[PDB]
Amino acid sequence: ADERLRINSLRRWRLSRIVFRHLADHGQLSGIQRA
């Protein structure tokens, strides 16, 4: 991890499209409307 960065030197909601759609349609994601 850090070792890898060193040797290199030497050289939005995190849900699925489906599960997002269900919550966004049910009004459970705050702020998300439909256009």
């Binding site: 499209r17 997002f20 759609r21 966004a24 705050s30 702020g31 998300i32 409307q33 439909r34 256009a35």
Partner: protein
């Protein structure tokens, strides 16, 4: 309560320190929400509180922002703004007012307080080093 009243109340302890108070030239409070009515209610509350504390306040409305996106199915996010600019308030007044209005900040509303403190030049810069 018609008869049963608290005979006396314990006022909180506010001590007058010896250190000098901080001075704010301006104090801009930008509140963001998804609802214009909630921002209007909060503006009314904040302005009335500022009047009742003697603070000088001005209110304006920055332009709204709209983030649209697609998964067709089109989704939207609205962000509405209200800006409350306070002028010429000391450190203690600013702290008490901010505590009040931040504790009474409604759900779904975020705040950004920009404080412009007034400071004197450091002693070490007044005259060149010889």
């Amino acid at each position: 309560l018609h008869v049963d009243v608290p005979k006396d109340l314990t006022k909180p302890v506010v001590t007058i320190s010896d250190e000098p108070d901080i001075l704010y030239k301006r104090l801009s409070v930008l509140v963001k929400g998804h609802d214009k009515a909630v921002l209007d209610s909060y503006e009314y509350f904040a302005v009335l509180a500022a009047k009742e504390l003697g603070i000088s306040i001005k209110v304006h409305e920055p332009p709204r922002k709209i983030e649209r996106f697609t998964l067709r199915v089109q989704y939207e996010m609205r962000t509405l703004y209200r800006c409350l600019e306070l002028e010429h308030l000391t450190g203690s007044t600013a702290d008490v007012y901010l505590e009040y209005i931040q504790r009474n900040l409604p759900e779904g509303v975020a705040m950004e307080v920009t404080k412009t403190q007034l400071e004197q030049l450091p002693e070490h810069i007044k005259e060149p080093i010889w």
